[PDB]
């Protein structure tokens, strides 16, 4: 905890030291200002002598001290703010890397709102409570120490009087401040309860009107708001008492401090300037107390934010993200098998997902699953989740030992409703390739021509640089699926995993989709998951899944003449 907070400021060792030096300089040459003002006043009022040549020099000299204080304050502010920024940036980048490196299963139990809030709000608190708050704390502490210590040096007898009435009175103020707060909380609770009755009923005007009971709601609300009104009166009385007592006490305390200082004769006589210095120091101490209180509150909030931020950066990923082996050397075309895998979602272990599999995929096949949960094979083949009780083999060797990046690069998937990123079409297509920057302009046009997407990609109102997304230029479903079809062609997937929408679409544009969605059967091992009979009659195997198991694993001819039907 506290040991790790020192680590954050370790990159900034030289910047922060200068800030503390300039802070202490400013405090020193700012708490010796009341002392000189007393001398200046005594030059002209306690005994005027015969005060025009011994006054210009003093003011002219003190102006220089004021200038130095201003410069020191400026430099301190600049250094502290820059250090805060340069710590917050590092925290933000490291937190984003740690979050993005984690496994998929973590995002199921954690909402995006919490992660975004940690990414923006809490980092500001953790970067401000280690540099831009300790300066204020140190300044407040120095102010209080120098103020109280030097207040005894001017008049000890009057300093023991100001520490016998101010302390006990301020104790009552803290006690009296909680009564008003609890009364206000009570009134606010009653108002919230009354409002919760007026939001439900407006939400159900249809049912409150069928029976004809509408006025009765008006009297119920009237009674509730009257009850809220009566409790609010008891708050006003206490507030009036507080205001009167606080004004009277302050005025009488100042008058009593002033009055006593004129009756001290002989032993400790107070010239005009010394009284002014005394009063200034009292004010300074009064400010410093509130400074300390604010510092403590801010420090506690900062520790609260740090408690949550100090966790994601130190969490081990559940499954390996790198450090694998790539066999390559060709001799690999979609030859994968299953060994009766059993697993449910890690998010929900209640209902089973896959209880049995005996499915095999050969080279140059258009094998097609069918049934009624069958879409989760997509998740398994790309190594996002992990089998619980089973084994997936790819050309003898299993997919566990392989490096996930190369495996996910070779396997390419196409769906019906694809997520579209907020960028130009000239980039989204390049997103498939290994290097999105190293793409020629004509390659995008050629790929659009292959997928027949030039009808809209070239002819935008903003051209190729159109921002595509849910906002602004809304692309149609057919076009936004044709762009996805064109996306995967650049990475040359040896295994293609299509998908079928249950809801039908317009047949006017169906020719282009039928020329890209299932016309990509260019010798690639394809596991089409569809329901149309055309794919069933235009493929090798039509294996059927039902009740979490594989029943039929024959070609189309064998399954064509079912024993029952």
Numbering used by the authors: 156 to 205, 207 to 528, 532 to 724
Passage from the reporting paper:
ABCB10, a member of ABC transporter superfamily that locates in the inner membrane of mitochondria, plays crucial roles in hemoglobin synthesis, antioxidative stress and stabilization of the iron transporter mitoferrin-1. Recently, it was found that ABCB10 is a mitochondrial biliverdin exporter. Each monomer contains two parts, the transmembrane domains (TMDs) and the nucleotide binding domains (NBDs). Here we report the cryo-EM structures of ABCB10 in apo (ABCB10-apo) and biliverdin-bound form (ABCB10-BV) at 3.67 Å and 2.85 Å resolution, respectively.
Unexpectedly, we obtained both BV-free (ABCB10-apo) and BV-bound (ABCB10-BV) structures at 3.67 Å and 2.85 Å resolution cryo-electron microscopy (EM) maps from a single data set after data processing, respectively. The final model of ABCB10-apo encompasses residues from 156 to 724, missing the C-terminal 14 residues and 528-532 in NBD. ABCB10-apo dimer adopts an inward-facing, wide-open conformation, awaiting the transport substrate. However, ABCB10-apo exhibits a more wide-open conformation than other three, suggesting that either ATP or BV can trigger the conformational changes. ABCB10-apo holds a much bigger pocket for substrate, indicating that it is more competent for substrate-binding than others. ABCB10-apo may thus represent the initial stage of substrate export. The ATPase sites are about 30 Å apart in apo form, a distance far beyond the reach of ATP molecules, which is consistent with the low basal ATPase activity observed before. Our ABCB10-apo structure is consistent with this model in that TMH4-5 are swapped in the inward-facing dimer. Our ABCB10-apo structure which is in wide-open conformation may represent the initial stage of export, namely apo form, because it contains a much bigger pocket and is thus more susceptible to substrates. Although it is possible that cholesterol is located there because that region of ABCB10-BV provides an environment that accommodates the interaction with hydrophobic and amphipatic molecules. It might be also the reason that cholesterol can be seen in ABCB10-BV but not in ABCB10-Apo.
